[model samples]
Target: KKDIKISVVVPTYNTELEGLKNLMASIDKQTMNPDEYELVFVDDGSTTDTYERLQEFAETRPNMTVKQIENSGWGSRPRNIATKMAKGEYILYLDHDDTVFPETFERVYNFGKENNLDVVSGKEVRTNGWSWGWKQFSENNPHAEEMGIECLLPMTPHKFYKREFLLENDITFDDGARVLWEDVYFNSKAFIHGAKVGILADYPTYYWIATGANNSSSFGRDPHEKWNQINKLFNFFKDNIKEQRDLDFMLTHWYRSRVLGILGQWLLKNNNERIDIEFNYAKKLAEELIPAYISENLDKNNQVKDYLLRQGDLDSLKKLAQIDAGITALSYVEDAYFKEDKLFFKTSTKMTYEDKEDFFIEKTADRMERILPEEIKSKLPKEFFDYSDDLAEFTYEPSIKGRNSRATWKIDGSTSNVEVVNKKANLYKIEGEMSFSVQINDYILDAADKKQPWDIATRFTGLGYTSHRALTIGKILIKTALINNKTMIVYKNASGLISLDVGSSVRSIVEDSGVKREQILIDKTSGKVTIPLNEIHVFGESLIEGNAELKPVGISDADPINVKAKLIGEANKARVEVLLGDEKLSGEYHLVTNIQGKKDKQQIKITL
Candidate 1:
């Protein structure tokens, strides 16, 4: 472990060999010198070859060490033990099943060394994009200004910790029988201990290759029994957070995840009994903890949900939950119209109350009447009935298909207002002008371009988020040229909005299923490949037409040029035609028809 920069600590038990190999390979691929980092593997009672294979590799691989011990029920014990045994200047906690990017070790190490930070967390990506990782916090969130240590960082162990800082504060995870809330406990203490924290949010450094059912947030477990774990987390927040600012930020982190986190489990199960157990527990915690601190970051919808949950208003909770979950009915485009060269539509959007009593007002109305004094009771009707502005949110997109796409535009509503056509029912109608003649490129405003040759390529928006796709409402073929060189996307900085790059004339097309080897096409000779133009589509926004075309630099008008179009999906989704390929070809160029809302719909038809 000589000259070690970061100790990559991993805890393994009943691990998959493939996952272990991926983790080791990811480490070896890191941009940092192999001598600058060491792997501290803690084998917490594995019956598999996890320990043996790793032990064998450690003998030949310098800066690698392994420790084996009987299974400690939860990951907390092994993680704690590994931290104590770590030898590097900084420590990074990664799960054995997950892997890191090549630049991860170097990027994190250099950032910590340069800033002298205590704890810094980066983004994590999963193959399926949903993991119990960095999604809880974002660089774009309002909490970005607060010290990462003081504010809510992800409770997952995937973060860089300055070794001395952890030792100085004596920070450790909750050491007990495979407990819940261990991460919450450890992260809260790290924040309170005055560690200089940071966030590396540009790109995902860790890949959470999730496996197995035995994980945190284990539902089907008793909610009443879990109450003690919540108590321990709150106690840590109250006892250690001294400053008012720190307390506010710290509690904001705690309640944001825990309060809603408990309810999330109920929502997932959609079980009414779980709600009785969890909501009452949340009510007690909210009353005692002043959960109002979390309101600053909570959404308007959830803010109301949390407020009512704290109030123990089950009817109100039911209304919000049901409506939010699309219980009443789903909204879709009812009519389409174009007025004075602009698109506009009308629809009703509010908590349902007229016919069914299971709506927002109907459910909560009686409770409000029974609990409030006359002064408040009289005001309730005014607050509830005078919801005119909420009905005005009629941002609608026109349905334009194929080459008729020119009729498609976005409604600006600048010329008129959303009229309350039905006062009692709150059904509304809209009259508006399109963001007139606005092209899709209008959204690409001064945003940074991101490269896509590796990983899931996404563009950074000044709005502080990465958008992977940019939808074009209409079709227009812009000027084209063969730049004929390797291209890239700008991902290092945050920008306003992201759009698909109009540049880069060639790329292989991959269906939603994933990239198949045959779906990819490249010509090392011509230094170009067939790519979908604009990747545009009908509903759910997919590529309906291929936009890639090559105007031969010096070929004569009559010269022969070959064009290949391939489709992969159900054999009959849509009728496709390829127009501009092969000078002497007779048949229609096409991709197999792809229709929406159909399964086994794989298209793989090629034409020239």
Candidate 2:
């Protein structure tokens, strides 16, 4: 009844049915009504039952069309053809094995339409435990440059483009067997052609699934061919983008995030012959396309690598690559406890490179210097020797991860100290205090069952790289407290990592503790005993009615006294009163619960 607002285009090539079904399920479950959007699927001559399955799905769905084309060896041709066939105001490109959230279409469409934008980009997350471009999506950006280099990232086809803008500018994907990173080529034209770009960062719309199948773009591609494609991309930017500053802005990001990335850890995995070929291609690109000023914008680590690549120093590059690959962050927890409704912790983190215990960065009177091997240092420029800018950008933030759900959230904290610990090694230690409130309405906790565990982790970014690891505890430490009618426990797990567990009842909390020590208070003058309910986790206003006995410690002639005990309401404590009379109490005593029907006795040792 309503004209199509958005056309969902997908290119399929021998897609796995399991992942395809997952994508289809999400499509059907979208919050946008079916009549508002059309589905146009292009099958790139799939040899499997993929074509038949798509045909069957289109037959029953309204405003859906399917077309089969000769194999193009890549997604470019199929995507272009589907775009031509689309009948909506805008086009949304989706991979066959990926999925979209229920609100993806509605949110992206409304945002694009309300802002009168030519290109609209939504937030995307991957199943492979990697997140990118999240900071850019924290708020709406009317211009692409507002997102900084993050705007050029994730060069995937999972974005929204106005159909009229594509048609008017004649922008389409490059179709060829050797063409790599076509999405980059395509988006470059859109940005250069004066298209109004808007970003929707409030919600994540697309899920880039990992199907375990070989990705066509990454596999079966020659190293030389990939560089050739990159060369074409650079030429495109230089040819059309006239403004020098704008050209540098785009070129700097591409060179840093993409060009240099080719020689990263992946280079270490190749054989000698392939390694040499890859290094030569990267060297040529660095010397010809990347100027000295662009190299200066890189971090200290990359600046050194870029210089080596440009000078064709493969030996030095390999040595530095090995060190960079071995660099990792280690987090240590000094202490943790619960006060009020929050979990507080103190931690110290340090980085390790190769066999060294700490990665060294020297702080001089004027600037900070990164210690490196003499051979690598000889090739570095004078500017690369000083890493004061990189050190100033260091960040160490603590976060929590749900063990069962595998979801992560940032916790509140600030760095308390950052100073050199070892002058000889130029080693530095970073200390921070962080707190997580259990009373906050976190979706992960609300959906979790009782006794669910959450891991304590930190995201440490420093020395031109980022590392994430679980916080390690030096010794076994356990602290328990009752807040907002919930019993919370923070302790060291079996793997020597910090973990938090929360429950509504004391029983659930003590189920793992077979025999544990508990504290109780005895008032000698009043002859009254007060015991904190530390043994179990209880929810609601339930009363724990039971019997107990108190006996003097190491007194052979003193008879045990009967006591009445009842844990009432949400007080989180039990009151024991002497039944007969007030007997003279002295020294230490053991208050043992004699409740019937329970297997284990709740025991507490009281001291006056």
Candidate 3:
């Protein structure tokens, strides 16, 4: 252990031998020199080959060590003990069931050594995209920037902590948070304290194997119990944030899951006759929970939370939250054992009000994008720095059957096909595939923001989810492409107005000044929009028919693009429109646009 560079801490709660062996093999093949690091496995009463194999591995594998503790049943205790016993300069906390690529430790060490980052958290790819892990994608919600409560939200996965930094800042998981999410307690504390951090792009340091039961959020289902856990999680956050002398950015991504979005629905399903009681229950929960604990990112005495909870919402919620007007829009998520009581882990499968708010962030982050410390940006791949305006390339080939498969996202191309994943987020990779079958007739702008692949692939996923099977909304990102027949829609659900812009072609944002402007618009990214699931609307073929007559005069022969903005109710929704006039230019036309909305629903009408 003396020569180890990174010490891996893994706690076991009855792991399978085959899985553990596979994990060990992956660790053994680590890109970094094996002699540079050591492995420590803590068996907190895990019956898995700990006694038989760990003792042997400790004896045979030079840097490997083992500690067997009485089954404390609590996950964090084992990890905390492992951290205390670790001897390496850097520490990586891993679950006994997880596996990493050979490059995991090596790249992490490289990232830390180069950036001198105290805590480097990279994006993770779970066997399934995880709710616990989704907080990392929130770009609008900075870490306690203008918002203070965000400092208390954190997800633990594929992150490495600088030993000295941890000790210096005294960052550790909260003992009070007994659930595995205790790591959030540790992460939130670190964020609040403003620890120096670095982000590694889509490089996955950990791959969580999904278990429907015995997991953090989904395993247990009961509103009161789930609510209690959520409240506990919230309490821990509020407690720590209140202690901070300075407030940081708010990554309000935590409670943005199904709970808030489907709370009212959940209540109805629990009991149609129990309406008043449930409403009061929900109202009270909102009052108590949203204030000091969760929605701390929102200003104190925020009407947004108030409006959504009080009126039992469509009108009131839409005004403050993002309203989904689309008839084809399915519920955002599926409820895992979701019945009536508090949604699991404060959220459920249904789209939560918060989910609608921050969906667009998907267009920005790829597998490499992570909620990292700003101090270590230099060490990250320059691709991350250059990608904001640049179209993210997704290597996925759209098969006829694959068109609507969200799983086809292919965050790691070719890798998705081989792995059996259970996490929903991991199912959707942040990328877009250029289709040879589909031809654009006019000017097209392919935002391909970070989500080109993910959103496009979602079209082909899980058999069928979209309501409009016939609705083919062409990608309007205008770069080296032609858009045939439609006007684009832009919306700011915030102001009840959707702006229209045409999707026209330009060789490059670099060659034509228009492309540059479009790129800049994407980069400005300063609205309170918070779109969920990459909150972008192509306006489909619905809006294009409206602007056909107003074709551009100078650009004859060049396809005219229509951009129109329309409005929807509050709930943070918008319709996007793009417009171009000259019909004669034969070659290229340009449109500048921005829109915002909370929910990605088909009912979001294109109000002309």
* Positional deviation of residue 573's Cα in model 1 after best superposition, in angstroms: 32
lDDT of 2 at 445: 26
Residues 1-608, model 2: lDDT tens digits: 58889898998887655657777888888888889999888989998887887788679877889998998877788889999999898898888877787778898899889888888888775664423463455566767645443464566778899999999999999885546567877777777677788887756678776668775555447776777878888887778877577678778878877777767786688888988887787778777777778876777778877877788888877776776677777677776655545666777766776424656666656677766687767667867778666555667777665554444455653544444454454454433334334433452323343445677777777667777778787777776544544445677877887877655222323323332344455566666565545443333443444556778888888788766654343654322232323665557776665432122255566765
lDDT of 3 by residue, 1-608 (tens): 24667999887766655557767877887878878888888878866554676667568887888888888766667777888888888898877666775567877777777767666665455553212333343232212233433323345645777777777777766544355356666776666665656665434456665545664454355455555666676666556665343322322443444235444234334444443444455566566755444553432113233345644553333222222232122122111111111111010121112223221112224432322235433333343323233223222222111111111122111121111122345232222222222221111112222112112111222101122121122223221111122222221212221111233211111121122122222211221111111232222222221121223334558553434432221222222333322222232223323322111212211111
Model 2 spans with C-alpha error above 4 angstroms: 15-18, 142-152, 216-221, 262-267, 322-325, 337-343, 354-356, 362-368, 375-379, 400-416, 422-456, 472-608
Estimate the TM-score of every prediction: 0.59, 0.75, 0.49
Highest lDDT: give the candidate number: 2
**Model 2 Cα shift for residue 582 (angstroms):** 40
RMSD of 3: 23.0
List ranges where model 1 is wrong by over 4 Å: 48-50, 130-152, 212-220, 260-269, 291-303, 327-608
- lDDT tens digits, residue span 200-264, model 1: 76445676664756645554266776776776667777887777776776676667667765553
Looking at candidate 3, the ten consecutive residues that score lowest on lDDT are 338-347
Q: On a 0 to 1 TM-score scale, where does candidate 2 land against the true structure?
A: 0.75
